[PDB]
Design a protein around this nucleic acid. Structure first.
Ligand SMILES: [Mg+2]
Lengths: 206, 186
RNA sequence: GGACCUGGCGGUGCUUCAUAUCCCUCUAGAGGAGCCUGUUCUGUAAUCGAUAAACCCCGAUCAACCUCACCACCUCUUGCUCAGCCU
RNA sequence: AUGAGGUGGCAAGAAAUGGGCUACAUUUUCUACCCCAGAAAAUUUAGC
């Protein structure tokens, strides 16, 4: 690494600094004073104090990226968001008066809820002890399941069975399916929760 | 037959022959007749063997199967009676040395000496067509180096698709001569 | 023989924790296709051989009637330089 | 003669395994541009 150990990661949170000194606790006052002495790394290209910034969508875009072509990944992400928005508007214009109150048109809300609906809380850990592999249930950390939902969504959208259907169109369809607890990603979560319930007797190996 | 990575061609030909032996015929014929591009071949032989392959494609891991609209099994030993006639007609003809590098189909390399074209043109009748090997022999090169222009002088654009499957970069500089219409009336 | 001192125990097991190497975790390949190839076996009297040393004539590419190695026949010699030898 | 030459001959096949070279596309390809356009169509090896 080209940064010395003294260098610390920057804090881009804009409203953190505007906090009144009166609200600051003694510990928070101390750490604010301490950061004065520390050296701070240059903020990386990426996160910004923008009010429209979304770390989850940024991570999804980075996970779609191939060969460092970030422009194309962000283009695909924004196209997916626009497609979801337009599909929801089309479904809203054609809905009954009482059905328009339960139709979400915010693409960010749909994206977050669809990813949350696919998060597995339990997983397996291959462990060979007696000469034969043994899959044991283990509770998944929050970061692990957040990553797994994204990875499953992207892998499902990268299947070759979808011939000539462009990535934004496939991803919008999968997101809207997972928003309603439907589709193959929700089934992949269910088949993991079931295959980890089928081996609850193997937890004693942990 | 367009196969997938798990497809075994000689194996499937073997069961296709077992079927016809069980039915009972003298020396059933079913072997690869054309190597066109990766995982795509043309099998040739008795219609029973081809029907067996078509109906057992799933077991043989064949993604697609399409019977050719041709009279019979070309490029196989079944065409042996057609060897002796052609040879005689070629005997009278004096074949000169090709001016350009003409590639063969029997073994997919340039014709070297004119006295061997006479028998290679007859072996081509009863031998598989080594088209993929010919495409490699003509277009194989290191990454980054330029490719020559390619012109398909004749009807159709099938060779264009085959080249696309074989070499994308060589296909980038491919063009076809229009034999159905002309832009300008000369 | 009584009492006591130092121990060593090349010590043996458990208990607690440091518990990093190495697994699991992440990314991309490799299983397909066509070529050339290393090795091994068998073959011939012989070697299947090696191209800072052939051929090429888009890219590459095989023997080339090449050439050094090898088999079978032979020949030159006091010769190149009190020579010569990729032992 | 372990030196120098002449003549001819020497062409090889099988698998089992290891490696290398090519194309392998929809997040693609062609043109204009250099990013607001138009058309086409399981084992196992490394790394951080
Ligand atoms: Mg030899």
């Amino acid at each position: 690494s080209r940064y010395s150990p003294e260098f610390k990661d920057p804090l881009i949170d804009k409203e953190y600094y505007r906090k009144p000194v009166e609200e600051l606790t003694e510990e928070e006052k101390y750490v604010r004073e301490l950061k004065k002495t520390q050296l701070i790394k240059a903020a990386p290209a990426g996160k910004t104090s923008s009010v429209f910034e979304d770390p989850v969508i940024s991570k999804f875009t980075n996970m779609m990226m191939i060969g460092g072509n970030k422009v194309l990944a962000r283009s695909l992400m924004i196209q997916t968001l626009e497609a979801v928005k337009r599909k929801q508007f089309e479904k809203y214009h054609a809905a009954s008066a009482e059905e328009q109150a339960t139709i979400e048109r915010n693409p960010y809300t749909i994206f977050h809820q669809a990813l949350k609906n696919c998060e597995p809380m339990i997983g397996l850990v291959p462990i060979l002890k007696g000469g034969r592999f043994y899959q044991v249930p283990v509770p998944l950390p929050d970061r692990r399941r957040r990553f797994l939902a994204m990875k499953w969504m992207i892998t499902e959208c990268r299947d070759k069975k979808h011939q000539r259907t462009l990535m934004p169109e496939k991803l919008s369809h999968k997101l809207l399916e997972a928003f309603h607890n439907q589709g193959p990603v929700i089934k992949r979560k269910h088949d993991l929760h079931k295959m980890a319930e089928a081996n609850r007797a193997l937890a004693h190996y942990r | 037959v367009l196969g997938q990575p798990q497809s075994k061609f000689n194996f499937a030909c073997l069961e296709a022959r077992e079927h016809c032996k069980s039915l009972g015929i003298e020396n059933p014929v079913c072997e690869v007749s054309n190597y066109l591009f990766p995982d795509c071949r043309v099998i040739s032989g008795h219609q029973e063997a081809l029907r067996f392959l078509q109906k057992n494609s799933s077991k043989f891991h064949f993604r697609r199967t399409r019977m050719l609209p041709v009279s019979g099994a070309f490029h196989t030993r079944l065409m042996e009676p057609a060897v002796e006639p052609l040879t005689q007609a070629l005997k009278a003809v004096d074949i000169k040395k090709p001016l350009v590098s003409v590639y063969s189909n029997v073994h997919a390399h340039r014709y070297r000496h004119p006295g061997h074209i006479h028998k290679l043109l007859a072996q081509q009748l009863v031998s598989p067509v080594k088209w993929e090997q010919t495409m490699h022999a003509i277009y194989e090169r290191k990454k980054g180096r330029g490719f020559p222009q390619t012109f398909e002088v004749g009807p159709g654009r099938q060779l264009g698709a085959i080249l696309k499957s074989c070499n994308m970069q060589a296909w980038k500089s491919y063009s076809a001569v229009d034999v159905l219409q002309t832009l300008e009336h000369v």
